[PDB]
Design a protein around this motif. Structure first.
Motif, mmCIF file in Angstrom:
data_model
loop_
_atom_site.group_PDB
_atom_site.id
_atom_site.type_symbol
_atom_site.label_atom_id
_atom_site.label_comp_id
_atom_site.label_asym_id
_atom_site.label_seq_id
_atom_site.Cartn_x
_atom_site.Cartn_y
_atom_site.Cartn_z
ATOM 1 N N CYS A 121 42.048 36.101 35.515
ATOM 2 C CA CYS A 121 41.639 34.943 35.448
ATOM 3 C C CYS A 121 42.307 34.288 36.503
ATOM 4 N N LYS A 122 41.783 32.986 37.278
ATOM 5 C CA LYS A 122 42.125 32.405 38.532
ATOM 6 C C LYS A 122 44.050 32.393 38.772
ATOM 7 N N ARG A 123 44.574 33.689 38.966
ATOM 8 C CA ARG A 123 45.963 34.198 38.926
ATOM 9 C C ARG A 123 47.403 34.086 37.249
ATOM 10 N N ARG A 124 46.230 33.041 36.911
ATOM 11 C CA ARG A 124 46.487 32.292 35.414
ATOM 12 C C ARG A 124 46.642 33.126 34.349
ATOM 13 N N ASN A 125 46.981 34.445 34.217
ATOM 14 C CA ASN A 125 46.913 34.923 33.129
ATOM 15 C C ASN A 125 45.274 36.503 33.242
ATOM 16 N N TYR A 126 45.402 37.379 32.194
ATOM 17 C CA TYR A 126 44.890 38.426 32.260
ATOM 18 C C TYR A 126 43.960 38.497 31.674
ATOM 19 N N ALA A 127 42.656 39.086 31.268
ATOM 20 C CA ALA A 127 42.266 39.744 29.654
ATOM 21 C C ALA A 127 41.425 40.971 29.098
ATOM 22 N N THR A 128 41.002 41.672 29.754
ATOM 23 C CA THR A 128 40.323 43.197 29.760
ATOM 24 C C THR A 128 39.313 43.605 29.342
ATOM 25 N N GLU A 129 38.939 44.635 27.647
ATOM 26 C CA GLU A 129 37.916 44.791 27.872
ATOM 27 C C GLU A 129 36.787 46.362 28.001
ATOM 28 N N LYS A 130 36.655 46.068 29.313
ATOM 29 C CA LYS A 130 36.190 47.665 29.424
ATOM 30 C C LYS A 130 35.092 47.251 30.803
ATOM 31 N N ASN A 131 33.553 47.990 30.137
ATOM 32 C CA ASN A 131 32.289 47.487 30.648
ATOM 33 C C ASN A 131 31.166 47.929 31.086
ATOM 34 N N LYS A 132 31.889 49.230 32.141
ATOM 35 C CA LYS A 132 30.438 50.421 32.409
ATOM 36 C C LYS A 132 30.222 50.262 33.693
ATOM 37 N N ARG A 133 29.175 50.019 35.308
ATOM 38 C CA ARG A 133 29.044 50.913 36.060
ATOM 39 C C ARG A 133 27.404 50.329 36.552
ATOM 40 N N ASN A 134 26.499 51.256 35.137
ATOM 41 C CA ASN A 134 24.920 51.422 35.718
ATOM 42 C C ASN A 134 24.482 50.231 36.614
ATOM 43 N N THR A 135 23.613 49.502 35.798
ATOM 44 C CA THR A 135 22.532 48.207 36.556
ATOM 45 C C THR A 135 23.687 47.494 38.218
ATOM 46 N N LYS A 182 33.208 35.434 33.611
ATOM 47 C CA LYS A 182 33.826 33.969 32.383
ATOM 48 C C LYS A 182 34.677 34.335 31.651
ATOM 49 N N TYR A 183 34.605 34.091 30.337
ATOM 50 C CA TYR A 183 36.151 34.772 29.365
ATOM 51 C C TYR A 183 37.106 33.491 28.587
ATOM 52 N N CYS A 184 37.942 32.887 29.411
ATOM 53 C CA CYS A 184 38.711 32.065 28.849
ATOM 54 C C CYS A 184 40.775 32.593 28.490
ATOM 55 N N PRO A 185 41.047 32.246 29.233
ATOM 56 C CA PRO A 185 42.594 33.167 29.213
ATOM 57 C C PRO A 185 43.252 32.287 28.279
ATOM 58 N N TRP A 186 44.886 32.324 27.890
ATOM 59 C CA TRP A 186 46.099 31.483 26.985
ATOM 60 C C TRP A 186 46.620 30.570 28.594
ATOM 61 N N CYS A 187 45.915 30.892 29.484
ATOM 62 C CA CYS A 187 45.475 29.840 30.508
ATOM 63 C C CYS A 187 45.562 28.061 29.751
ATOM 64 N N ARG A 188 46.379 26.946 29.672
ATOM 65 C CA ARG A 188 46.134 25.984 29.785
ATOM 66 C C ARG A 188 45.038 26.200 28.115
ATOM 67 N N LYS A 189 44.290 25.565 27.882
ATOM 68 C CA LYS A 189 43.890 25.540 26.577
ATOM 69 C C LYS A 189 42.373 25.889 27.010
ATOM 70 N N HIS A 190 42.025 27.186 26.988
ATOM 71 C CA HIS A 190 40.685 27.876 27.289
ATOM 72 C C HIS A 190 40.731 28.568 29.004
ATOM 73 N N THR A 191 40.210 27.274 29.394
ATOM 74 C CA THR A 191 39.704 27.920 31.002
ATOM 75 C C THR A 191 38.710 29.019 31.439
ATOM 76 N N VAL A 192 38.386 28.723 32.241
ATOM 77 C CA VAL A 192 36.973 30.441 32.951
ATOM 78 C C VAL A 192 38.051 31.040 33.205
#
Lengths: 71, 228, 49
Positions: free
Chosen positions: C11-25, C33-43
């Motif tokens: 997320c906007k240089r203020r964190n990174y969260a993870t999770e895998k995902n795909k390629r297809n379609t 989206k998602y929310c980092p631990w940056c600030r309280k939630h955040t884009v």
RNA sequence: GCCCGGAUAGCUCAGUCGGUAGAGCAGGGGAUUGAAAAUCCCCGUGUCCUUGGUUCGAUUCCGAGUCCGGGCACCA
RNA sequence: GGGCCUGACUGCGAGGCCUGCAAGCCGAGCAGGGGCGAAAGCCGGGCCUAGUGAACCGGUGGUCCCGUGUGGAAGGGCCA
RNA sequence: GUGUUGGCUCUUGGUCGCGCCUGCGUAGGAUAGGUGGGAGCCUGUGAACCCCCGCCUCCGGGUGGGGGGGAGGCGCCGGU
RNA sequence: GCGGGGGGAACCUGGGGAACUGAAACAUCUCAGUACCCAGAGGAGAGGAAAGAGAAAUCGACUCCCUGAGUAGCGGCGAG
């Protein structure tokens, strides 16, 4: 003894081996080559006063011969 | 071993073995050429950049005070009070979006364009298509756009001189008059030395200021060692 | 390697969260989206390869 | 996972150190045609892979993207 | 089938399924933080029971804890 | 590869430094390689008129020299 | 005119130097620098006054004992 150096001692030992690397590159050491060997110099000569030799060994040689060249 | 230039004498003055230094330069150049009228010496140079990937493409302007009176014209594009301020400051071309329109037509007599944020839209979009990759259109951090039309054109007269590496990585600018004032051309050469030096993107690795010189319009071309 | 490749969100240089995902379609298309631990939630944003 | 090359006519591929896109073959058209040829003239199509910046302009120059081709090295 | 949207959230969990080991698995509710309604509330991936792999080793995005006299640093501790 | 394993030499390649000495898609008096200074420049040719000679080519032309003499030429100006 | 050499149970210095078995396989690893071939000084040699320690503005030859932790750590970080 009959082949050390003449200008000191350089006649002996050697334990060694290898296997392979890939360390601060991507991992650990492909470790192993339990091997053993020799390890030494070379021969040559000059003249006392009409009729001579030298024999000796490599480097130590060069400096040396220079030395008694001084005399 | 004989060549096609009467300049030949001046060339004899010219002993290209040393790169010498600045003040020396003022003197030997001033002496070197006073042909028709009085020399219009200039400094020119080249830097270890790469202008294709504009991430080093520089330009702007230092403020070589002088007194001044010659080199790199500019268009003060705005309205009433700005025409006032910049025109008086030290402008060669002055007006506004009316001058912009005249240019769209068939009048362009200014290398650098400086317009105040009041006719800047007309300047950049009307004349955008015209001044284009000529270097004649206003840019917000290219000493070309803002309200201080008066301040910048002013220095243009007390004295301006700008910067703009051309295709291959070199700049040109007035940093002292012929019979000069010499010290002046020096000082401005300097202000440019500095602002340029600053602009120097951190993407440089080694001999950055490669070639730095003073050359005139139609005239001489000699490198200068901005060190001395 | 199959149309299934793993990416993860930052997320906007203020964190990174993870999770895998795909390629297809829709392949690349990768805001999210998602929310980092940056600030309280955040884009956050997501993307990050 | 790095390191090189390419992307052009339907095919295979040339290509200013920025101004034109060109071969060879396929395909088609007439003369020749016991005859097959070889001969013999004539053509056909191009975001020059994509996206931006340099330049008056750019197949070309540089960055980036996707793809294919090469290679070289590891793999608990 | 249509609309709007990311919780397929981090911090975490009390208390149970099974199991000797490790496993794997179920989860109200408190916090920060949002999203679907105006809201009574649902959402910490899917309708569920298979798409899975210790430990070492080493990589990368941290972090900004440690540094073998001290400043830094090779290097390295925990996170992801 | 390198160490004793010394001498003269014919030479050929990559690379960076400067010169050409060079730079002709097209309107462009014209083969403008750029970007700077930027309307003036020059007289050991007393000149662009003429002479040959040196050199590089896309007819042209660019450039470097020896001479021949009687205020001249060109850059400006404009223009593409 | 000297010296040595020739010995010697064990201890001793250096010279050269191995599989088992372990790691319930086994190739790094392991036993280990252990067994053994050797050369040699002794009555004991070994080491023996610091380009040391160690970080306190501290110690002070070398050797052997107790302790220093079996921690500090070395590693198919596994047997060890």
């Amino acid at each position: 003894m009959k082949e050390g150096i003449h200008p000191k001692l350089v006649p002996a030992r050697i334990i060694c081996g290898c296997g392979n690397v890939i360390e601060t590159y991507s991992t650990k050491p492909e470790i192993y080559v339990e091997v053993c060997s020799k390890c030494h110099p070379f021969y040559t000569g000059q003249q006392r006063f009409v009729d001579t030799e030298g024999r000796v060994e490599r480097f130590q040689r060069r400096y040396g011969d220079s030395y008694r060249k001084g005399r | 071993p004989k060549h096609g230039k009467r300049y030949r004498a001046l060339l004899e003055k010219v002993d290209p073995n040393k790169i010498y230094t600045i003040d020396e330069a003022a003197h030997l150049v001033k002496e070197l050429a006073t042909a028709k009228f009085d020399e219009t010496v200039e400094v020119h140079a080249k830097l270890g950049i790469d202008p294709r990937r504009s991430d080093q493409n520089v330009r702007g302007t230092v403020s070589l005070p002088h007194g001044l009176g010659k080199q790199v014209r500019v268009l003060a594009i705005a309205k009433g009070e700005k025409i006032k301020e910049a025109e008086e400051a030290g402008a060669d071309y002055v007006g506004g979006e009316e001058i912009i329109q005249k240019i769209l037509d068939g009048w362009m007599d200014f290398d650098a364009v400086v317009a105040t944020p009041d006719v800047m839209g007309a300047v950049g979009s009307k004349l955008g298509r015209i001044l284009g990759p000529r270097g004649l259109l206003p840019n917000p951090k290219a000493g070309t756009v803002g309200f201080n039309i008066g301040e910048i054109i002013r220095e243009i007269k007390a004295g301006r001189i700008e910067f703009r590496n051309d295709k291959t990585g070199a700049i040109h600018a007035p940093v002292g008059k012929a019979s000069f004032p010499p010290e002046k051309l020096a000082d401005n050469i300097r202000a440019f030395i500095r602002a340029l030096e600053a602009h120097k993107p951190e993407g440089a690795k080694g001999t950055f200021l490669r070639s730095v010189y003073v050359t005139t319009t139609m005239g001489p071309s000699v490198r200068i060692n901005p060190h001395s | 390697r199959i149309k299934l490749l793993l990416e993860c969100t930052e997320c906007k240089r203020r964190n990174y969260a993870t999770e895998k995902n795909k390629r297809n379609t829709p392949n690349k298309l990768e805001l999210r989206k998602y929310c980092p631990w940056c600030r309280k939630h955040t884009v956050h944003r997501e993307v990050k390869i």
